[PDB]
């Protein structure tokens, strides 16, 4: 149900410096008729330029195969750009050419105290990172187990029983026929 609301909400588009726009993430625009400005909420005053006059084929939309909800706002009316205690911002621009990073610290002791933890030190681990039946009686349980699952492997059977596995292996060859391959591999019958 992608539709159009108006396509007539005429807006503008201004390019800003970095310190004010990222701060925004309510002043007063003074329009003098062909040189406008802005009374900023406090604070300084800056001048706007017309970046482009013909700004046709440029509009504005919003959003709330898999389609999704489309919300068509309006158009663009004109192109704008903000141009600029101006020496303090130049000093702030001069302070931008001073930032850097640190340097590598030097461990300054008697060395062998720090060097003792390298090879052998006899201080192991200190971390939890990667440390890792009767014949007739068992056959009665085996017939009870064959009544539930007949075509079943002996791996979980040694787990489910967990009793005398040698006596379990003897009874498995006694009154049962273990199928070798096929779908019921290692499964009694």
């Amino acid at each position: 149900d992608l539709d159009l609301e108006r396509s007539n909400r005429q807006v503008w588009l201004v390019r800003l410096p970095m310190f004010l726009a990222e701060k925004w993430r309510l002043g007063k625009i003074r329009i003098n008729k062909s040189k406008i400005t802005l009374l900023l909420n406090e604070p300084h005053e800056y001048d706007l330029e017309l970046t482009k006059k013909v700004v046709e084929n440029e509009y504005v939309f919003t959003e709330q195969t898999i389609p999704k909800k489309t919300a068509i706002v309006g158009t663009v009316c004109h192109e704008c750009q903000v141009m600029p205690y101006h020496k303090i911002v130049e000093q702030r621009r001069n302070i931008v050419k001073l930032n850097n990073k640190e340097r590598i610290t030097t461990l300054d002791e008697t060395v062998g105290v720090t060097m003792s933890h390298t090879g052998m030190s006899m201080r192991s681990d200190n971390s939890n990172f990667l440390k890792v039946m009767p014949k007739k009686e068992i056959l009665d349980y085996l017939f009870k187990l064959f009544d539930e699952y007949d075509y079943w492997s002996l791996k979980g059977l040694k787990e489910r029983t967990r009793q005398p596995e040698a006596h379990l292996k003897e009874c498995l060859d006694k009154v049962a026929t273990l199928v070798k391959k096929g779908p019921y591999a290692f499964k009694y019958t």
Binding site: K136, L139, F143, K144
Partner: protein, 160 residues
């Protein structure tokens, strides 16, 4: 589960190895006194539960004689060849009988002494004929042969 009680009685029919009575086997199995296991007892092809009193006869391989064994060798003509597991159960001690039935009378399979000759079913016509010395065997294997049409051409140089 009565199938566990019937198979243990069927094992008791093989463990007895004789023709015991049905009520005596019911007394030998003691607690087993049902009648549906006797219905599958005569229905069992391995346990020959005959109607003439209590007769319990097993199956597998009835060849308990070397004369029966030669007929078994004449049975598998252009077919297959069995091991010896049915033979050792239908007859006690068979590998000694293989040694006495030498010369194509029991071409078995002497697998290993540790395997106690895991025998097979075969028989030739002469079989043994072991008077060939092993010195003759090495000289039989030390000869290289000019292949293809060379050896027919060398036979005309030799005589054949």
């Amino acid at each position: 589960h009565d199938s566990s009680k019937l198979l243990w009685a069927t094992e008791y029919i093989q463990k007895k190895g004789k023709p015991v009575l049905v009520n005596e086997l019911l007394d030998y199995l003691s607690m087993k006194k049902d009648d549906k296991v006797i219905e599958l007892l005569k229905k069992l092809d391995r346990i020959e539960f005959d109607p003439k009193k209590g007769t319990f006869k097993y199956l597998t391989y009835d060849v308990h004689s070397p004369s029966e064994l030669l007929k078994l060798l004449r049975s598998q003509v252009t077919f297959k060849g069995i091991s010896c597991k049915d033979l050792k159960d239908g007859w006690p001690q068979c590998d000694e009988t293989i040694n006495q039935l030498e010369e194509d009378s029991k071409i078995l399979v002497l697998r290993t002494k540790k395997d106690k000759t895991p025998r097979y079913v075969w028989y030739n016509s002469g079989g043994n004929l072991k008077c060939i010395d092993e010195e003759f065997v090495k000289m039989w294997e030390n000869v290289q042969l000019p292949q293809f049409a060379e050896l027919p051409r060398k036979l005309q140089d030799l005589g054949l």
